[PDB]
Amino acid sequence: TWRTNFYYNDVFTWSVADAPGSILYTVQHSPQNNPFTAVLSQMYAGWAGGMQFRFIVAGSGVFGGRLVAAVIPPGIEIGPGLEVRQFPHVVIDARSLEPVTITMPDLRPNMYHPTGDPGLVPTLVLSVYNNLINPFGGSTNAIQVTVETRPSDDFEFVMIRAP
Amino acid sequence: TWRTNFYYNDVFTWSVADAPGSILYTVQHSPQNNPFTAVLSQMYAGWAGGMQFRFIVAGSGVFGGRLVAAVIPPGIEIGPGLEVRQFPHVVIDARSLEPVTITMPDLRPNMYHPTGDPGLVPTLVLSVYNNLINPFGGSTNAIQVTVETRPSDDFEFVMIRAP
């Protein structure tokens, strides 16, 4: 189905100008981060469970540099000097050919979350850990990173919404 | 589920001024006529099957008059002198206490219909057959008719839509 495949959600740019600690991508955990859960969330009041995010770095396994994708607990705001490796995180190397996937989990497995006004949910943040390096000639000094998502196996919608 | 219950879709007015042959309500057969199929139709390319429409006339079983609800084949346009009883139809009496339900069926059970640009689909039309009569004093000369829908048992969505 749609819930077993990853689907394109977004894209962001990573350039040699983005210094360590810069945040290049951020998103609150929500059904709006997948195009199918975004549709279905309009007919349910509640949801629960994780969402997987898969990043493909278009650096032809050649560029140097690294991002850290980290899951930030609710009501912690993240700055640019902010350490994130204390949070559940995965490292994304510019030279990797393969996709790197991170699970944004449900941090409150105790209570269904609203599909409406979200309350207190985790945030996914992607920050520069090592500077992007274009070895040798540019003039390509920026690359793109695609973001695709799929609901985790524990993702669910509940409570039909009164229309 | 949502597909077993009728849900409010719309409302229309019937007044003593509406003469026989007036059209008081009309709608193309479509998933947009139920609030749940309207949501789900955004993630599918195709659909098929019938939709039930239930009308409750708010005439306290007292007003005189009748409407005919008729299903009009595609590409027949209906005027106000237009006979409809040759089409599948049900009669709605102003004096009825109970709801009156009509099935708008899939007239092309041979081919899934698009949820997008609809092509050629039947139309539900409600026309005055006998004038609404307020016996005795008004000053209520108009009543409302609520419209509720539910997918028929053969209703289906197919072909996940490329987002």
Numbering used by the authors:
A (entry chain A), B (entry chain A): 67 to 229
Quote the paper.
In this study, we used cryoEM methods to reconstruct the structure of the RHDV capsid to an overall estimated resolution limit of 6.5 Å (5.5 Å in the shell domain) and solved the crystal structures of the S and P domains of the RHDV VP60 protein both at 2.0 Å resolution. The crystal structures of the S and P domains of VP60 were docked into the high-resolution cryoEM map to construct a pseudo-atomic model of the complete RHDV capsid.
The etiological agent of RHD is rabbit hemorrhagic disease virus (RHDV), which has a single-stranded, positive-sense, polyadenylated RNA genome of ∼7.5 kb. Mature RHDV virions are spherical, non-enveloped particles with a T = 3, icosahedral capsid whose outer diameter varies between 32 and 44 nm and whose structure is defined by characteristic, cup-shaped depressions. The only capsid protein present in RHDV, VP60, is composed of three domains, which include the N-terminal arm (NTA), the shell (S), and the protrusion (P), the latter of which is further divided into P1 and P2 sub-domains.
